[PDB]
């Protein structure tokens, strides 16, 4: 599958909080954890995914992102991608 470093930034231009939990939309278990440079490393992904990034239970404490990988198959490396995490408010 696809592996990538994903740099997330909130729609309000703040970094995503260090320690936020990343999940595939529709799944309850963790996929990864946002680190101290507001990035996460993810593997086993299809070409197009949707993720939830969460650091609390209230309004404006989670955000949603699409994750679109380039088409190329059969490579061993990792993409360095960026996307917006749109706040759920």
- The CATH number given to whatever domain includes residue 7 is 2.60.40.2070
> Are residues 29 and 22 in contact, defined by beta-carbon separation less than 8 angstroms?
no
Where on the phi/psi map is residue 49: left (φ > 0), alpha (ψ -120 to 50), or beta? beta
**Reduced 3-state DSSP string for the chain:** CEEEEEEEEECCCCECCCCCEEEECCCCCCCEECCCCCEEEEEEECCEEEEEEECCCCCCCEEEEEEECCCCCCCCCCEEEEEEEEECC
Query: Pairing mode, if any, of strands 2-10 and 79-87?
Result: parallel
How determined? X-ray
| Distance between CA atoms of residues 48 and 13, nearest Å | 24
Q: How many domains does the chain have?
A: 1
Name the strands in the sheet holding 32-33, side by side, starting at the edge strand that comes first in the sequence: 32-33, 21-24, 48-54, 62-68, 79-87, 2-10, 39-45
Tell me which residue has tokens 């470093």: 5
d(CA 30, CA 73): 25
Residues in the chain: 89
Contacts of 72 (CB under 8 A, 6+ apart): none
Domain region containing 59 = 1-89
């Amino acid at each position: 599958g696809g592996r990538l470093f994903l740099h997330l930034k909130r729609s309000d231009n703040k970094p995503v909080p260090f320690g936020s939990i990343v999940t595939i939309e529709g799944q309850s278990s963790s996929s990864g954890i946002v680190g101290d440079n507001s990035g996460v490393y993810l593997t086993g992904l299809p070409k197009k995914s949707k993720i939830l990034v969460k650091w609390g239970r209230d309004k404006n404490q989670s955000c949603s992102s699409n994750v679109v990988l380039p088409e190329k198959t059969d490579i061993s490396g990792a993409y360095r991608l960026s996307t917006t995490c749109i706040l759920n408010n």
